Nucleic acid binder design. Structure first.
Length: 108
RNA sequence: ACUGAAACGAUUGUUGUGCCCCUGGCGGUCGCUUUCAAUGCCU
């Protein structure tokens, strides 16, 4: 619940108590852009992963066809292998509740 | 392991509370217990 920041904010809002909500939002938009520039001049944030692009490129490769595309037989073994292990310690995230689990899944 | 193995939409609850089959009403009207009779017969 990170109670400490509510004390920080309440000091800045008490010191500048003359503000209304809209001239406050004009402050905080400038505070965010300072934070953004400062974070990337120091390099203090990561180039985070891109997993949904990869599984989406593989979703297209299984299920989209234009006439005259080359096509392969799907490896349905991976869809069974993921079900056979869905309740076994060697599965890291839960299996999909809306589908078979042939693509990587994550908690809802 | 049947997309599996076990699997209570459940618990509690008043169709309730008030209510005059009520008000008005003459068993009424007409009607002779009537009609006839020797306290009699003799001293």
């Amino acid at each position: 619940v990170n109670y400490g920041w509510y004390r920080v904010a309440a000091h800045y809002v008490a010191n500048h108590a003359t503000w209304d909500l809209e001239e406050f939002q004009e402050f905080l938009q400038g505070f965010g852009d300072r934070l953004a520039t400062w974070a990337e001049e120091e390099g203090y944030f990561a180039e985070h992963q891109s997993p949904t692009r990869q599984i989406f490129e593989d979703y297209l490769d299984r299920y989209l066809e234009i006439q005259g595309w080359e096509s392969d037989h799907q490896a349905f073994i991976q869809e069974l292998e993921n079900y056979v292990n869905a309740k076994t310690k060697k599965s890291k995230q839960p299996i999909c509740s809306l589908s078979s689990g042939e693509f990587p899944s994550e908690d809802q």
